Amino acid sequence: MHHHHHHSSGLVPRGSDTSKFWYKPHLSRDQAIALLKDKDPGAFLIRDSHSFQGAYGLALKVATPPPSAQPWKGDPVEQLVRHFLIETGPKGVKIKGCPSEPYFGSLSALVSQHSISPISLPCCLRIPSKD
């Protein structure tokens, strides 16, 4: 090294805060797809739902959502992007679409449960920051 400064200009980062990586409630459907069309199947984002108050729109880029995927008639990536909504009631949050999923409460709860129990998600949910 040319010089040796005392280590006081270095910070200790850990970065377990991944919420801002996926949570952005200001995006609409097309905007969500706009991100996901550059994302590999498994990645998601949580936005707010315009449909119901107190719902979060979960946009998931899946591998393939058809029963066969041979008869195709849809828009390629836009149909590979699935939209579900996490509705928080007095109980908590759960993803509308699945009748076998419990009420977690916090988004981080279901986010961390991603690769443990992908219930509502057809594809094992993956965090952009953590996989």
CA distance 108 to 63: 23
Choose among 113, 118, 76: nearest CA to 97: 118
- Residue 84's beta-bridge partner residues? 58
User: What 3-state DSSP class applies to 78?
Assistant: helix
The Cα–Cα gap between 51 and 127 comes to 24
Calpha distance 77→129 (Å, rounded): 22
Q: Which CATH superfamily is domain 18-127 in?
A: SH2 domain (3.30.505.10)
Distances (CA, A) of 34 to 26, 38, 40, 77, 114: 13, 7, 13, 10, 22
- In order of 6, 57, 80, 123, 128, the CA distances from 26 in angstroms are 43, 11, 22, 25, 18
Alpha helices in the chain (DSSP H): 19-22, 29-36, 76-80, 107-112
Which experimental approach was used here?
NMR
Cα(95)–Cα(83) distance, integer angstroms: 10
